Structure formats: C-alpha cells, structure tokens
C-alpha cells in the first residue's frame, strides 16, 4: 500500500491559515475509499472530517466553513484550516482507507502535531 507521508509537526499563526500535509503516492491496485481527519479530544480522538462516496462531511459547527481537504490531486488529502484558533493547538490524524483488487481494505493513519503562534 502507499506510505502516508506527513510532517511531524506544523506551526500556524493565530487567526491565519495553515495546511497540514498528508500525501501518498498513488499505487496501482489501491483505490482510495475513505479519508478521515480526526483531532484529539482529551484521551481519545474524534472525527472532524470525512470524505466518502457521497463527498465531504464536516458537521461540527466549530469546523463547518473553515476546513478544506485537498481534492484535485490524487494522493493529496492535506487539511487546510482557515482562521486558526488558539484551541486548535492539538494533534491531528490523517486516516486513509484503500481497497485492493481482491477486495481487501487497508487502513493507515498518521498523527501530526499542530502548534499555533500568536504572531509571525
């Protein structure tokens, strides 16, 4: 399966915008079937974004209208956050599910720490 490639951490500016990269090289046989982004919520995680066969779903009021996950370049499922909040400092998980020719599904994920600085 494709390696999910992410930086270890990303730093953005308070009230600015930032991208958290999550990219894999497409690989013959492996069809992407689900993408999720999750954020830590105390001692577990919660979904903040899902892309599936019916498109993108961002259903929390705190996120709807300010998250964009890349969609035009195969393998690029990077998350961009509009107007960073100090409380956006957190660990974010990029999670991708692929299907193989035999119908097997492989799921991989990666945790990226997001830091938020008050000024540039």
């Amino acid at each position, epitope marked *: 399966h494709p390696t999910l490639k992410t930086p270890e951490s990303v730093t953005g500016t308070w009230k600015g915008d930032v991208k958290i990269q999550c990219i894999y090289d497409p690989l013959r046989g492996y069809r992407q079937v689900l993408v999720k982004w999750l954020v830590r919520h105390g001692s577990d995680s919660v979904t903040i974004f899902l892309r599936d066969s019916t498109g993108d779903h961002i259903q929390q009021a705190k996120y709807r209208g300010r998250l964009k996950v890349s969609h035009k370049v195969p393998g690029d499922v990077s998350l961009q956050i509009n107007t960073l909040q100090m409380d956006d400092r957190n660990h974010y998980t990029c*999670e991708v599910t692929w299907q193989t020719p035999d119908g097997n599904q492989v799921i*991989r994920d*990666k945790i990226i720490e997001l830091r938020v600085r008050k000024y540039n």
Partner: nanobody
Amino acid sequence: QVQLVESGGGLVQAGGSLRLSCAASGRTFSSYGMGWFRQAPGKEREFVAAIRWNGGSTYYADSVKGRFTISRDNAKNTVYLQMNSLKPEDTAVYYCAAGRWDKYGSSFQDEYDYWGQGTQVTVSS
C-alpha cells in the same frame, strides 16, 4: 529524534514471568504509538505488541496473545511489557519502537520511526 532504551531483560525459567520496560526521551511521548518487536536467533524481526498514544488501545501478535500485556505511563515516558507463561521460544532480543501511527498499522515495523538497541530475554528449561 526520540531515543528509546529498554530495561528489564534477563534470564527467566520456562513457565515464569518477566516485565520489560522502555523509556523514551523528550517531551512528546504522547505523540507516538509505541511497540515491542523481537528477533530470535536466525529469524527475522517480528511484532510482539503495541499500544496507542493514549494508552487505551492495544494490539498483539497471535504468538503472545493472552500471555503478554503492554501498557504505558505517559507521565513517565515509559512503556511496559508484562510477559507471563514464558516459553523457551520467547527467547529473543526485544526492541522498543515509537511511531506516529494512531489506530492502525501497528504490527508493521515500517510504521515506526525510532528503535531501541534491544534487550536480551532468555527463557530456559
């Protein structure tokens, strides 16, 4: 660059129990899923057990299911492997590893970034 150091290895009799630990350096321990792997003489390195960043999900190789339990203390930057009902075939060098997987892939060595030097465990009979 996180450094990992295993402790607690040694000689134990078959049927006995042994507790390994692994200390991680730094202030970002909770950024990592942690795992134990082992490598016996002549054999390739294989998965033993893993534990999610939160200490709340664990994963085991079929070879050690039930007998071995992995745990972590994020306040101490430490992961533990409690090995019960030991068998001579559990003899190996045991390696601690850290990676940025969350819930998935923990049985695969390529999902880990950093490795300890390993500690010898010998189970005699």
